[PDB]
A paper describes a structure:
To our knowledge, the best known system that exemplifies this paradigm is the antibiotic agrocin 84, which penetrates into the cytoplasm of the bacterial pathogen Agrobacterium tumefaciens strain C58 by hijacking the PBP called AccA and its cognate transporter. AccA also plays a key-role in the importation of the characteristic plant tumour-derived compounds such as the opines agrocinopines A and B discovered in 1981 in crown gall tumour tissue. The mature AccA structure is a monomer of 493 residues composed of two lobes, each formed by a central β-sheet flanked by α-helices. We identified the pyranose-2-phosphate-like moiety shared by these two ligands as the key recognition template for AccA.
The unliganded AccA structure solved at 1.7 Å resolution adopts an open conformation. Indeed, superposition with the liganded structures results in an average rmsd of 1.5 Å for all Cα atoms and structural comparisons show that upon ligand binding, a 12° rotation around an axis defined by the two hinge residues, Met292 and Tyr493, leads to a similar closed form of the protein. The biggest lobe (lobe 1) consists of residues 29–280 and 494–521 and the smallest (lobe 2) comprises the residues 285–489. The two lobes are connected by a very short hinge region of 8 residues defining two short segments.
Residue numbers in the entry: 31 to 521
Amino acid sequence: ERRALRLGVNGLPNSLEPVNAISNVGPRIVNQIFDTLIARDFFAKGAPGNAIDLVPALAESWERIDEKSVRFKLRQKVMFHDGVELTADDVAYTFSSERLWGPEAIKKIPLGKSYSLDFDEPVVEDKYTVTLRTKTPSYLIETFVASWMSRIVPKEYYKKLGAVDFGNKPVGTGPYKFVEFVAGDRVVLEANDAYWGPKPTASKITYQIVAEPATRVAGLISGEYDIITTLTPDDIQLINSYPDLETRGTLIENFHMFTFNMNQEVFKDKKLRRALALAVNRPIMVEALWKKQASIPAGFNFPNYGETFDPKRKAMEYNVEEAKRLVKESGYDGTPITYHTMGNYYANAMPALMMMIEMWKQIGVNVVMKTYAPGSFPPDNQTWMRNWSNGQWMTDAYATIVPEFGPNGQVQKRWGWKAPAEFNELCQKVTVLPNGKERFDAYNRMRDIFEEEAPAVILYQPYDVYAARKDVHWKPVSFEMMEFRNNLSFG
């Protein structure tokens, strides 16, 4: 009786294990299979899909015990897809040293420790009561359990299969259950009619890879898909010309950037990094490539940070004259500097780079584009400049400045950023402090240091574009995922 939902997608994750699925392509699938203790209600109080309000989900209630622990009271009679009732043991296993953050878990979940809080082992109080703890103070537990790191897995089934096999046959408590995974082709899910929350409205959901955007668009016009993903503002005109189709767009909690291999001689010091950063004309790029729909943030600072968003911050500096001076006073000899890009994996990456190459030519820096295929990122030492993006995954400023740019992150450890000691000291403080003047000011000083050092250069917050049949009602949310709970209906 319910319609089957057909999605034309850009790609699929290599695993359906919820943490290993973290990417631009995984969350739209794993958000259906699993649930979290606390859920973010993006549509709360009439918000246009960007609210940061947190509501009960698998946890009916919770109570903070002290500076490092929160006791959760679980919803009762919740069923995993295989008919196993959800208990405190499943939640304890989800946040355990064994599965997630411990030294053994590292080979199974590569970002398990990197993206997690400083967890201590959870405590099971009774069948429906579990306490999550951190080894050092953390006022981020509640916020973290509403994030993409926190989908609840079943203990017994996950242990039996192991992380790899679980990723190929996942079981969760979510509104849709697993049917099929054809690697590099399609994922099929079916309605979980035992779901504890709003009943699924589609009988089935198929995530079909259609690699090229023009082919994805043709698929929607051909009547092959109900919703297609990964379009840009340039597609709006064509789609909306069809009486039965329309685009649905939103800014997402992510930023596009370029960064440097600071192990390379030319990028060890901040001089040329700053020169390149100061020559980036973001307003022209936003108008030219995004139809003014992308947003230029005032620093490493986004509205989803909530209490740690600073709406009064000064804009990131644009100064061609200073940029020219810096190149001249730096060691820079005019030798071409490479900038690696995985084609247009980041929307508009190649035209954005063409524009920046001209801005850089004008200050006396010769930058050359280099492309690579998926899974072929070059050996680190063969790279100089490269593009990147970071999904801002917490309703708090902790992510991604601390896990990516902090003392434990890849920018310093793999990419050679020798961050000022003050920056690392502040990363530690914001990790352990509650919200207040000290934590708020620490993020602003970290944002200032980030701009002064230029280990990366923020371009903008992208504007994601979907296209859909007008008969299929579904609203985008401000994140790299698709939400169907109370947000998918047909007719």
